[PDB]
Structures are given as structure tokens and as C-alpha cells.
RNA sequence: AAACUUUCAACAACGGAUCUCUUGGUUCUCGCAUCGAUGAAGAACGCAGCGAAAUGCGAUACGUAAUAUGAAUUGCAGAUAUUCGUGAAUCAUCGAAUCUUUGAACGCACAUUGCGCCCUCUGGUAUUCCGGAGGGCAUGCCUGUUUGAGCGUCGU
RNA sequence: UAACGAGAUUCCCACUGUCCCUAUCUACUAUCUAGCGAAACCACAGCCAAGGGAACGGGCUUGGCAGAAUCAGCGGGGAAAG
RNA sequence: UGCUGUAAAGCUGGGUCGAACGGCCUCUAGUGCAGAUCUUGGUGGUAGUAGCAAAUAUUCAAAUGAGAACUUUGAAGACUGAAGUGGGGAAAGGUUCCAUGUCAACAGCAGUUGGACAUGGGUUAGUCGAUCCUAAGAGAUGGGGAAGCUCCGUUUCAACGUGCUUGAUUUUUCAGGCCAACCAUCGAAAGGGAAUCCGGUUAAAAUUCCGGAACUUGGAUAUGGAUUCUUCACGGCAACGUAACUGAAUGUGGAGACGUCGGCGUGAGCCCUGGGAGGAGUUAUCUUUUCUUCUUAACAGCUUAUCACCCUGGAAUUGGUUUAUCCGGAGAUGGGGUCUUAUGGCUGGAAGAGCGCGGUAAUUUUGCCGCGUCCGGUGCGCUUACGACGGUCCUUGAAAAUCCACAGGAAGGAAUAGUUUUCAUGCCAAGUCGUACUCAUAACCGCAGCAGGUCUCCAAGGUUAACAGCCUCUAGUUGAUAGAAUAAUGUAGAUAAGGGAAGUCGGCAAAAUAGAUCCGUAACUUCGGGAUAAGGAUUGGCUCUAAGGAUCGGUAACGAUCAACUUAGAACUGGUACGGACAAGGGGAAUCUGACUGUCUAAUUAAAACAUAGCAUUG
RNA sequence: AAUAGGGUGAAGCCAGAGGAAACUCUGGUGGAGGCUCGUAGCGGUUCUGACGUGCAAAUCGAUCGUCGAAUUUGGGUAUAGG
RNA sequence: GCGAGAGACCGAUAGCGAACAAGUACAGUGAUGGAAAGAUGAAAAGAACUUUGAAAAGAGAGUGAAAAAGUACGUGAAAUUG
């Protein structure tokens, strides 16, 4: 079986020196150097991976258009769908409850 | 003779603390206007492990009163504090577990932790896992509060000093035996270079006051004067007594 | 194993070349030359080492400027140019 | 090593230049004393100490 | 009796004593006062028609100018090099220059020939991006200039 | 005191050239040759017995004796060398 | 050659030689050697002596040459045996690389050979590194010490921006506004990090050259498109989709960015294998035969997924479900969708390349031509990458540069007009230093071409549990002074009648045991162990038998087709052999001692010594 | 950055059996441990083997301890002569 | 340091470490340590040419006052050797 060598001066099996073995059209078996895997973009509230967002090494996000980096919704590429829904309902219910505290206080003030 | 290990520790070369994995110092907020006069609300974001520490820490976020900006604080987590909980700190804060109150605002018998010795030092007393400080009494005319410390000592502190309601989490670590030299090795791997310990009587006379002899033995009293000098203080420093403790203290 | 076997593990230089004096006496971790004391402003020298003073002192180099001072003094530190004769 | 600094490589270039035998026309000059280059160096015997 | 060994002599070796010398050393005396930010001493790397050293020199590189002098240099080669002459050779003399990369070493850094910024000129369709040439930007302190700060403080 | 131990020790079973009691075989040496070619050590040297003697001599005194040049071994002596 | 003197010494004949030297009277001293384990240099005996014995091993012929055990070529015999004697690197060396010449010295024999000697040649980058970031750490600065060299401080008791944005104005001046918490600098050729691949080419360089095909960053800028009269786009219930599709200060979030182990799944490379088409080999006889070629990069488009999520619906006769037991009224099963693109498929790249055959041009530089390059299968295989899971800790397993996104709503914008270079295409540019070679039984360090030491990647067939041992293919070496003999004594290795530790301080050394299956296993015990306790039986070859699966097709309890190596049993058979080489525990009864795993006297001590968990005391 | 192949078989989980109950028993599954046999690796017990003017100023052969962690190791960095 | 003149000084193992391409060659990680080594002849006239040899060299010849001066070069002792 054909055996391979590193194509760079680094001789150690580090995180940045991983290789894949490929067969060329010359019939040769060569080592090919592999870039590090990308991680998912994650929600800023719950930490889950966001749907609809491309998985890229961070410098590569400056090359793709805006539709691969966001979702058409409030907080689109930042927070997931469920945490956006949960922010909206919480904002509505609390601000309604604030009015119930304000109006009730006046009645407590008025009744005495 | 030679400089003993006692003395070598103070130069701080291989005996400095191992702090790469630590999660920030655990302190109360700075006393600001809001805590002096009212209260400020924050929310618990994370409860995390701090290597080298037995007690978990709480990451709590607060709004900055004076600019549009979010302030994160590192607290010592009391037992029962959960992520998402609202935390109240200030003079007018309610008596709830995790709240930060002046000691004068807490009734007699209140259990409190991370207590300030002086007003505004951001916490000195009762910080390790399972420990706490008890409020014993108030002296309003002198603005002083009397507390009981984990060691059993009683102390008088200003009533403006703060504490956090509850008991520091992680209590009960020491009830389980370490069982292994390796567990002790992993324990001090994130604390400092204090382990293993060679016994003084196993050395030669250059190394220690206990070294040498044709049997291993101390050879003079192991109780050392408080007025002794460095290189002599090995053994029981300024002991009032020795031997097995019997009866009450 | 402290002799020949241990001598096999010598491949990390303690000193490299010094910019000031050029000796290979620049200690890598201390960033100090053990010979001339670079980067201190003063040159390293000791009265207990007179032979070290001989090796690197005025006159061991080129003296590209002091060489000609005594001739310039001899003519009273002239200014100007020489004059052709009648 | 293959990986080397500019300073090192410049020293190595000068070391090669000085490792040559005497030009034989030198010996013909009036009152010549040098018969050979006494400052030769072989890579395996005496090390450069760079 | 040979061989062998031992002693002497002759010649030849081995080796470098002896003798003769000496552009060196060593001591004494006489006279003089002249290093450096106008960048020293020292370091590195280069430079010749043919050079590795030593010696000299700095991209004007075994040297440029100038003054003096008056026919060489020389191991070989060779003038678009020279002889009753602005003329060979000359660290003879020396007052004008050149003086790489450094070094107290000065934009920042230096185990990197790594990285800025300012001005003038200039190339690529360019106040901004990329390139070239020249000139700049260290610290402590003094005198002065200018622009400022303080209910320290005067007056209106 | 279970478990563990290149720790110290006694006995048993198995096992055997440890022994009775030695023999035989192989490879590499040693050996001989061509080439190459050190070192330790060295007052001078080198056969014994007795004597006397710094009380254990290669030399001295009295005897025994005594014939070139040598090779492989050897470990009595050189109160061998370090 | 002699003479004189008791002597220290003086004189003279002969030879050699080439430039200065002596007697006498005095002066002066660094003034006389056999020794000092004296100093420096030189030279013997020893002595042609010790010795040039590890790493399986060499042989025939030709060529070259004065000369060949040692060079070159051919033939052969061997070995390393993929955990290499193969192919590369980091550290270190520094020209050792390559070609030509060449043998005085060196290569402890030799030498025509060489890492030697001499003369030349040789290292090509926007994409590989350095460079940049920060790590432990190092360290300037207002300063505080110190007689001082300097010490201390770096969140440093300090009036600390070589700030930035626009509206533009040219006037190189302004007008504002926004902030200044933090930020000197150095610190990784294995951490972080913009971007390149394949084919070909040299005596010696190549991810750097040539050919072709891309990519990234920075900039400029035109066309096309998209958007706007409802000003800053539409669609989908939704998850979310798209060629585009304003967005200042400020704020927030994500990526960078992270231990380790376990089995499971998928991919890729390798291994194995059927058919077919070329080529080689064998052919006494046989073998639809033994061997060999049949390949496909970065990049572009479309498509492809476990997990996750959305919609519907409303569950006990609880159901779904992994090798591993979790999940569901906080919405399961069921039905239908969305998303990440890791990875695979098809196409472009691309057959034009490479490969295998066949025919030619010819001393020729270098080619020129034709044909084929195809279709399948398999898995507790090996390695490696990824994935979904599960365990684990008084252990919870970097930082910064850098990039993106969101929140916010400043400002500016249409009616026959501004965008926006986050949509397509087009234009320009990418500096500096390194780059040869060795990486080791000869290029590094051990004084040396020293059996020592010195970090790491790739990894074929058979046997097997096995990356062990043993044999083999590719690749590489055949190096290590040689010849003749085979005493003693050695060193390394074997066997031995009968006895069986009588030897010896002592069973030191050796022997004996050993794999796997089945059986059987005591005291004691901290209940976990002890335990492979002890102690027995079996094992080859051949011919059979049985069991254990997958995919399709409607009492299918069935047929059809395919497919892997495990297990159990029986007959027969042999000089009773058979884990047949290899590989591979001796066991038991007790005492002293340290609980255990762990650690130290590099180079005479590994222990009962040190450590340890547990226990106690002290501040 | 590195670390064959086996043995044993901890919690947790599934099924069955017994019992009035409390609970207990059996078969699987699972894959724990400064566990174990044993390579690489790391170490260095014994022959008191070789060598002992060596291959070597500490090596060589066999035998041996350990081998998933208090494991092994490169580079960077810190500690400096009472 | 720069410029001079001298000596009852030393005479190449002496005198400075160095009379010479000496603070050189070389050693050590480093601070540092640190040698040896002068003389053909007036002049290279440094041996043309022939011959034996693969060559190095030899033998003749030649130059020189001398080769009993041949770049192993003034003289050329002793140990040691033919
Ligand atoms: C009487 N003179 C005092 C003078 O001694 C000094 O006080 C310092 C004070 O500035 C320091 O405190 C200061 O500096 C420390 C720094 C050293 O870390 C800072 O942490 C702190 O915030 C700062 N306020 C304090 N730690 C010590 C006092 N003697 O300055 C204040 C003063 C009043 O002038
Ligand atoms: C008990 N008193 C000792 C006294 O004996 C003496 O110690 C010396 C010590 O100073 C010497 O050491 C001396 O010299 C050595 C070296 C150059 O030899 C140096 O390494 C060291 O720095 C220097 N101090 C050491 N070689 C011997 C001791 N007895 O010096 C004083 C003292 C340390 O207090
Ligand atoms: C060519 N070899 C050279 C060689 O020149 C050598 O020279 C010596 C030379 O010094 C001797 O000459 C000697 O002359 C006298 C006297 C003793 O002869 C000495 O004192 C002096 O030092 C020395 N010049 C001379 N006789 C022989 C050459 N080989 O010098 C050294 C050397 C390397 O061996
Ligand atoms: O002084 C006592 C007291 C005890 C405790 C407790 F021990 F639980 F921590 N916590 C108290 C508290 C408390 F800390 F807020 F919980 C407040 C007042 C009294 C307390 C008694 C308890 C019963 C009610 C009266 N005070
Ligand atoms: Zn979320
Ligand atoms: Zn220096």
C-alpha cells in the first residue's frame, strides 16, 4: 500500500495539521490538509444551534451574502424562534400587568 | 544549615496559586447610590464551578444606573439560588435567600454569608462551601451588629456592612473520604504546590529543625514560641495546650 | 546515565549572537549578553578580569575616528583648504 | 535547519567564502611568507558556533 | 662456527640542542594634552582585473578631492595610462568629501533584515488603495515662544 | 489484619549437570598468515638453599650449579601494576 | 691525535662548518644539575606485541584500471519484513546536495570508491511557514526606594487620544459632534490564524518553475439586475425561503473556544473478491489459470443528514424506542413539512491528463500515430474522520487577535430620480526573510564515520486474540579487514545413564509450567476477593451433520434470490501425533515486615526507606 | 503530542420466579476500577553474566518491575550558590 | 594616550601570552581559558634535458663558492636506530 507524507513542515499530529488521504488522477495516493471544522451559530438565550444559518469558520462569514447569515424575523440570526416568541409574550404580559398595578394603586390611594 | 521549606514558600516562585482556570474573583457589588438608599434587581445568568473552590459561583447581571450598559457580577452561590432567579441588593431589599442586605436590616437569628468586615469591602466572612454567619444581636445606638463566625468566634460589625441571605452551597464535601493519593493530587493541581508533604523528622539536620538522629524523633519540645524567628517556627506555633482534646471548650 | 547518555540531549541553545559585541553570549531567556552586558548602556568590564579588557578595548578595532585626532591636533585643528605655491 | 534566520544565513555565507585554499599566485610575490591557508574549516570537525 | 646480544669507530638516520643573529620584548628618561549625540570606542557584513588571511577602506568601498613631489607598479596581466609634464607611483602630506548594517544609539521593535506616522516630489485612471525617491518623529533638563488649566487669586 | 510485594526467612511438591563425576557437540575467539598497529609499566635487572642483614634477598657470604635462539600456555614469585 | 693539572678543567692533531672570537688586570650577575611522582620538547624497551571477533552472508562473470575481496554493470544467494535497514519532517549541523576531475593526507585492511580533496552548478511562493495574536511569563513609562550599579510597581496615588466621525470647504485652513472603562512592548516555525490544486519538468529546486484550472485580501469602477409614486423587496399558518432587498452613536450575542474514557452508526483510504478487455509468467501434467493495468485534484452548480425544529392531532388495553432506558397532556405514537451539508451522488474541471498496449521517424533534438482505459460484489476486517449517545471528578478540563449577527433608530432618501459593490459580470495589485541536503549503527551531541543519547507522521499479504513472534510483496541494503586451520582456557549456546539439592551462605544458574475449550477449585476474608488457587481432561487431518441471517413478493408458519464466519456434534484416519515452528504462569504451607497503586541515592543500596488516603494536634 | 491485544465484570437497566408482607432469588444487559495478563513505552531486580587499557568516563545480553494513570514525553516559562 | 632618546637588560623553552595572517588557531552553554610556530642562497641561479617507474620518486645531467645549502632547506649535539 502507498504511504504518504505531510505536505508542510509541521511534523506533529496537531489540531491544525490534520490530513485526508486522496487519490489523484495520476494514480497517486497523497495526503491533503484539512481545515478545522466549523461550529454552528448558537442562540444567545438558550444556546441551541440556529436553523437557517450557514456553518462556517468565522472569517468566512464576511464572504457570503446576508441571506445565509440571518433569518427574516426579529432577532433572526441572533435568537431562535422559540426564544423570540417567549420574549414577545413576556414583554406583552408584563407591560399589561404594569398598568394593572398602576390603576389599582390609584384605587388604593383613592379609597382612603 | 539550609533554608527550610517554610521559608522558601514566601519567595512565591513555585508556590504561587494556580489561577489559569479560575472564573474571576467572587465579590459583592460596589456600594453605590442604589444599594445605600434603595435596592437594585439583577438576574442569575449562570451557576458555575470554580476550580480550586468548593462553592459554586453565580454570574448575576445588573443594569448600570448611570450609562446604557450591562454589568456582570460574580457572587458566591447560596443553596437554592437558581438560574433565572431575580436577586435584590440594597437597603430596602426583601429578606429572601440570595438577597444582599445590610446586617442591620436582618432580624436576630438570620443566616447570612459572604459578609463584609468593613462597610464596602465586598465580602470577607463565611465564604466557603457549607459555611455561614449568624446574626446574634443589634446595638442601634452604636450602629453595630454582633455576629457569630464559622470558627465559633463572636464579632462586632457595622450595621451598614452587607451579607447575602442563606447558606453557601456545596456544603458537605468533607463527609466523603478522599481515599487516594491521586484524589489529593487532583485537588491541589488547581490550588497550589503544597502536596505531598515530607515529614520534618525524615530529613537531615540541614533541612529541618526536626532532622537527623539515629532514630526519627523530634528531640526537643515541638511547641515553638510566638517570638521565635523564621527557620525555628516548625511544629506547633505558640500552642496554648497540646494532646487530645477532651471535654467542652 | 549522567555522562555520555545525558550529553546526547544537548540541542537547545542557551545563548545566541549579541548585536552589540557579536560573541554568541546573548542569553536567550534573560535577554542579556553575558560578555558586554547588552542592552545596558554601559559595557560590561571588571578589574578582576584584565585579560578580558585586552580582548575588547580601544585599539582592538579600527579606530576609524580616533586614528586621525593626533594628526588633526598637530595642525591646530585647521579649517579650510591647502594653497598652491607661487 | 531549513528554517533559518536572515542573520544566520548571512553568517553561513561568509563562512563558505573563507573556506578556500590559497590563490597560488600569492606565493610568487616578493618576500611572501604564506604557503597555505591556515584558517581552513571542515564542517564535521570544527563547528561554527553560531 | 653463524645468527643473536653487547662495546667502540665510520658513514647514514631520527631529532632539533649548540653557536652566530634579531624590523621583538623589557626597563629608565625626555617632551606633549587631543575621544563622543557635529554619533565615539567596539560589533557585523561587504569592497581589488586575478585574494583566503593580515593590512586598508565603505555601494565614491585595498579608496574620491586637495597640497607636495617627480617616473613608476610589479607575482602575472593590462589602458580608450603616463614622461622638458595640470604628470606615473605615493595611508608623502592632508584642511575638502564619501562613510553599508549597527553600537551611548534616538519613531516602535529586534532570536524578525518585523511594524507605524508626518512632509515634499513621483508611478499605477487616486486626499483614502498599492509602489518609488528625498526629508523627518527618543529621553532628562535649561532659556525663550506659543497655546492652555485651577473660585490659588486681583480688579472691573 | 484480607489484599498486594523484583523486600527478609523456613519447609513441601514438581523440576533439574548445583552435585556424585564428568563427557560430548556448535558458533566466535585464542592460534598461523597479509595488511594495520596501541597501552600499562620500566633504578639496574632477573635460577635456587642456607646465613647474616631494616629481624621474609635477584644482587651480599657459603654452597647447589650453569650452554645460543625460542613458541603456546600459566598464574608460584617479582612483598607485580593501579 | 696527543699534552698539562691531585682535581674543578686548560691546550693541541684530524673531520665538519661559515662570521665572529679569545688571553691578561679588574667589575658585575638571572653564573655550574642526576635526581625535586621537577618543567617543556624529543626518544626507547615493551612490540610487529594486545589486538582490528555484537548487529545471519556472500558468490560467478564482465567492464574499468599500472594495480580490484572492497568500484561499476549483469547473474544469483540473502536480509530489513510497513512498530522497516522504507518514505518525510521538528531540534541541531551548514554545503555535507549535484556534476566533473581526483587519491598525498583521512575512511584503525584496501581503495580506481567516498559525507575526503579540487573546480564549478544549485535553493524561484499573494495561497507553505515566519511575520500577527495572546499563554505561563518578560518588561518601558508619572513615579517610590537605593551611596550607586540599579530595585520595586504594570487594574501601577499621573492633566497620559501620535483619537474617530461627518458637511464639505480648498482656503490644506474649518465647522461641529461622538466618545477615551481597557489598550507601551515582548512572549509559540506543535496553541489561535485570509486564500491552491492536478499533470509535467532538473545533474541537483518545486503546493515556489511550466501548462491548465481556481481561490483570498485590499482597492477602483462600469455595465446588467434588484428597490422606491404604499418610499428603504416579496413568499410561507409555521419552522423558514430567496440573486439582491437603506441603517449612525451605542449596546448585546455568536464564532475563534477547548478534558477524558466506552460501545454504537456513517464516510473515506486500504484489504478482499466476480465478469470483461490488454500485457507478463508457467506448461512432463494441470490450473475458465499465477501475476499485473483499467485512475480522477483544488474549485463550480444541483442534490444529499443523524440531531434539532414547525404544523396537525390528542394518548391506560400506556405506547414509541437504543447494543447501552430514556421519552410523552410542559403534547407521545401517527400524518405532513423546515433546517445545518459533516459526508456521499451527478455534471463541469476532464481526458485534452495520467496509465496499459500496438506501430513507427532515426547515430538524430525530441517526438509521431492508433486502440483500450469498462461493469459489479463483500465485511464484529485495518486505519482514520465525523456523528448521535452514555459514563466520569472534593479534577469540570486557555487567552487574545480576528470575523459575523442582532437590538437601536441617527441620517439620508422617488416621479420621471438616489441607491447597493452583503446580487452577477468586468478592472488593478499582493512587499520582506526562509526554501539545497542529513535527521542518524557516518551529515546532531557524546574529543571519532563511538553497539550510547536525541520529538513526531504514513504502514501491504499469510498465521494469530494480536500493530507480538515467524515467512513474504513494494522500497532499501547486502555495510561491519580478510585468508587458512579448528589445541588448551574462555565467551555465547546445547544434550546427557542412574540418583535428584547430597552442591552452595543461599536452588545462584538452569530446568520444569505455559495458548484455547470443558471440568473442578480450600483456608481465610475488609464479602470486593483469595482464583489461572490447587488439580484433571481435550486439541491434527479428512469426510460429514446441525444451529445462528439479509432483501423482495398478498396459516407469508410461505416462496425467490443473496450472504459472513462463529459455534456444537459424528464417522474415518496416522509410528498415540496434533497450542507439532512461533508464542507461552511452576505450585503449595507458613513467619518477619510495609496496608495498598505510587517515589528516591544518574554512575555499587529499590528497601522494611519516602509518599499516601485515614487519624490527631497547633496558629 | 503519545499509550497492541486479552481477563475480570461495579452501579444503572430488561425479563422471569418466590413471598401475606417486608422483601428475596435466577438469567441477561451494561461496561466501573490510581483492577489485572501482556506489547509499544517508562523503569532497572538478578545473573553479583559480558566488558572492565570497553562499543561505552555506566555500555551489552538474558532475566525482570510497570504498562490508562500520583502515566510518558517535546517545546515555552519560572526558581541561582549558605 | 601621542612623540622621542636611551641601557653593564633578554636573546626564540629567554624576553610581553604574542619577534611570525597572536589575543590568532582551538576549547567551553557561559563568565572565561588560550597555544605552537624566527634563519636556503649574494642571487631562485628553486634543478632545462635524457632515462627507469602507474605515479610519488630514483639514476644521470644541470645551477651554485658550497647541494657536506634541494623550499623535509644555516650549523645540525644527545637519547634512539640502520
Ligand atoms: C496623607 N497622605 C495620603 C497619601 O498617603 C496617599 O494615600 C495612599 C492612597 O492613595 C492609596 O490608595 C490609592 O492607591 C492604591 C494603590 C496603591 O493600589 C489604589 O488601589 C487606590 O484605589 C488608590 N486610592 C492607599 N492604598 C495608601 C494611602 N497611603 O494619597 C492620599 C493622601 C491623603 O495624600
Ligand atoms: C558555616 N559557615 C560557612 C563558611 O564555612 C563559608 O562557607 C564556604 C562557602 O562560602 C564556599 O563557597 C564559596 O566559594 C564557592 C566556590 C567558588 O568554591 C562559591 O560557589 C560560593 O559562592 C562561595 N561563597 C564553599 N566552597 C565552602 C564553604 N565552607 O562561608 C560562610 C558560611 C556559608 O557561613
Ligand atoms: C615548512 N615547515 C615549517 C618550517 O618552516 C619550520 O621551520 C623550521 C625552522 O624553524 C628551523 O629553523 C630554526 O633555526 C634555528 C636553529 C634551531 O636551526 C632556530 O632557533 C629557529 O627557531 C628556527 N628559525 C629550520 N632549521 C628547519 C625548519 N623546518 O617551521 C614550522 C614548519 C611547519 O615545520
Ligand atoms: O432566629 C430564628 C431564625 C432561624 C433561621 C434559620 F435557622 F432557619 F436559618 N433563620 C432565621 C431568619 C432567616 F435567615 F431569614 F431565615 C430570619 C429570622 C430568624 C431566623 C427563629 C426561627 C423561627 C422564627 C423566629 N426566628
Ligand atoms: Zn433560544
Ligand atoms: Zn554582547
Write a concise keyword list for the protein shown above.
part of a larger assembly; 4 chains; B: 249 residues; mainly beta; 4-stranded antiparallel β-sheet; 7% helix; D: 50 residues; 1 helix; 0% strand; binds geneticin; binds (11R,12S)- Mefloquine; binds zinc ion; RNA-binding; ribosome; Candida albicans; mRNA
Would you mind describing this structure in some detail?
The PDB classes it as ribosome. The entry lists the keywords Candida albicans, ribosome, mRNA, mefloquine, geneticin G418. The structure of the Candida albicans ribosome with tRNA-fMet, mRNA, and compounds (GEN and MFQ) with strong density for the P-site tRNA. Chain A is Ribosomal 60S subunit protein L34B. Organism of A: Candida albicans SC5314. The structure is cut from a larger assembly and holds chains A (112 residues), B (249 residues), C (86 residues) and D (50 residues). Chain A is built from one helix and two strands. Chain A is an alpha+beta fold and 112 residues long. A two-stranded antiparallel sheet of chain A has the order 1-2. The radius of gyration of chain A is 27 Å and the shape is rod-shaped. The relative contact order of chain A is 0.10. Chain B has 249 residues and is mainly β. Chain B is 7% helix and 24% strand. Chain B is elongated and about 70 Å long. Helix content of chain C is 19%, strand content 7%. Chain C is elongated and about 85 Å long. Chain D is mainly α. Chain D contains one helix and no strands. The relative contact order of chain D is 0.19. The chains are: A alpha+beta (112), B mainly beta (249), C alpha+beta (86), D mainly alpha (50). Chains in contact: C-D. Bound molecules: geneticin (3 copies), (11R,12S)- Mefloquine and zinc ion (2 copies). One zinc ion binds next to α1 of chain A. Chain A binds five RNA strands through β1 and β2.
Shape assignment of chain B: elongated
Task: Count up the helices of chain B.
Answer: 3
The strands making up the biggest β-sheet of chain B line up spatially as: 5-10-6-7-8-9
Roughly how many Å is the radius of gyration of chain B? 23 Å
Number of helices of chain C: 3
For the sheet with most strands of chain C, the description reads: 3 strands, antiparallel
PDB class: ribosome
Keywords: Candida albicans, ribosome, mRNA, mefloquine, geneticin G418
Entry title: The structure of the Candida albicans ribosome with tRNA-fMet, mRNA, and compounds (GEN and MFQ) with strong density for the P-site tRNA
Chain A: Ribosomal 60S subunit protein L34B
Amino acid at each position: 500500500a502507498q504511504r504518504v507524507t505531510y505536505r508542510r513542515r509541521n511534523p506533529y499530529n496537531t489540531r491544525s495539521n490534520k490530513i485526508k488521504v486522496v487519490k489523484t488522477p495520476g494514480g497517486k495516493l497523497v495526503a491533503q490538509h484539512v481545515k478545522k471544522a466549523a461550529s454552528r451559530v448558537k442562540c444567545g438565550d438558550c444556546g441551541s444551534a440556529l436553523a437557517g444559518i450557514s456553518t462556517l469558520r468565522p472569517r468566512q462569514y464576511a464572504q457570503v451574502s446576508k441571506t445565509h447569515k440571518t433569518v427574516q424575523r426579529a432577532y433572526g440570526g441572533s435568537r431562535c424562534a422559540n426564544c423570540v416568541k417567549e420574549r414577545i409574550v413576556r414583554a406583552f404580559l408584563i407591560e399589561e400587568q404594569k398598568i394593572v398595578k398602576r390603576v389599582l394603586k390609584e384605587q388604593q390611594d383613592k379609597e382612603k | 544549615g539550609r533554608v527550610i521549606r517554610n521559608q522558601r514558600k514566601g519567595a512565591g516562585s513555585i508556590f504561587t496559586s494556580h489561577t489559569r482556570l479560575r472564573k474571576g474573583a467572587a465579590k459583592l457589588r460596589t456600594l453605590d447610590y442604589a444599594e445605600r438608599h434603595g435596592y437594585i434587581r439583577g438576574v442569575v445568568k449562570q451557576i458555575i464551578h470554580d476550580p480550586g473552590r468548593g462553592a459554586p459561583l453565580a454570574k448575576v447581571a445588573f443594569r448600570d444606573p448611570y450609562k446604557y450598559k450591562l454589568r456582570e457580577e460574580t457572587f458566591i452561590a447560596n443553596e437554592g439560588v437558581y438560574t433565572g432567579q431575580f436577586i435584590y441588593a440594597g437597603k430596602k431589599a426583601s429578606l429572601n435567600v440570595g438577597n444582599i442586605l445590610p446586617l442591620g436590616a436582618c432580624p436576630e437569628g438570620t443566616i447570612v454569608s459572604n459578609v463584609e468586615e468593613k462597610v464596602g469591602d465586598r465580602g470577607a466572612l463565611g465564604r466557603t462551601s457549607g459555611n455561614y454567619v449568624i446574626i446574634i444581636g443589634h446595638n442601634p445606638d452604636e450602629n453595630k451588629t454582633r455576629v457569630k463566625l464559622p470558627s465559633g468566634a463572636k464579632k462586632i460589625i457595622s450595621s451598614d456592612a452587607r451579607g447575602v441571605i442563606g447558606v453557601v452551597a456545596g456544603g458537605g464535601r468533607i463527609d466523603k473520604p478522599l481515599l487516594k493519593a491521586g484524589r489529593a493530587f487532583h485537588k491541589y493541581k488547581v490550588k497550589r504546590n503544597s502536596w505531598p508533604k515530607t515529614r520534618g523528622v525524615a530529613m537531615n539536620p540541614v533541612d529541618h529543625p526536626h532532622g537527623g538522629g539515629n532514630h526519627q524523633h523530634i528531640g526537643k519540645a515541638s511547641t515553638i514560641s510566638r517570638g521565635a524567628v523564621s527557620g525555628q517556627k516548625a511544629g506547633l506555633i505558640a500552642a496554648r495546650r497540646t494532646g487530645l482534646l477532651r471535654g467542652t471548650q | 546515565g549522567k555522562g555520555t547518555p545525558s550529553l546526547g540531549k544537548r540541542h537547545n541553545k542557551s545563548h545566541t549572537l549579541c548585536n552589540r559585541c557579536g560573541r554568541r553570549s546573548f542569553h536567550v531567556q534573560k535577554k542579556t549578553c553575558s560578555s558586554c552586558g547588552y542592552p545596558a548602556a554601559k559595557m560590561r568590564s571588571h578589574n578582576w578580569a584584565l585579560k578580558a579588557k585586552r580582548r575588547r578595548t580601544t585599539g582592538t578595532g579600527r579606530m576609524a575616528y580616533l586614528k586621525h585626532v593626533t594628526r588633526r591636533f598637530k595642525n591646530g585643528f585647521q579649517t579650510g583648504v591647502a594653497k598652491a605655491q607661487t | 535547519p531549513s528554517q533559518k534566520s536572515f542573520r544566520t544565513k548571512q553568517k553561513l555565507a561568509k563562512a563558505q567564502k573563507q573556506n578556500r585554499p590559497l590563490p597560488q599566485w600569492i606565493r610568487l610575490r616578493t618576500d611572501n611568507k604564506i604557503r597555505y591557508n591556515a584558517k581552513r574549516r571542515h564542517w564535521r570537525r570544527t563547528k561554527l558556533g553560531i
